[PDB]
Write a protein that binds this ligand. Structure first.
Ligand code: ZN
Length: 36
């Protein structure tokens, strides 16, 4: 196996999380911008 990285541009500023869609990162950040 010789594969590189995922190439996913939209990455979390707090996690190792990445996605191919800006709105998927937007939903992920709603958990970082507030709670309870
Ligand atoms: Zn995150």
């Amino acid at each position: 196996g010789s594969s590189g990285s995922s190439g996913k541009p939209y990455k979390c500023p707090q996690c190792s999380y990445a996605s191919a869609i800006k709105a998927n990162l937007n939903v992920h950040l709603r958990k970082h911008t507030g709670e309870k």
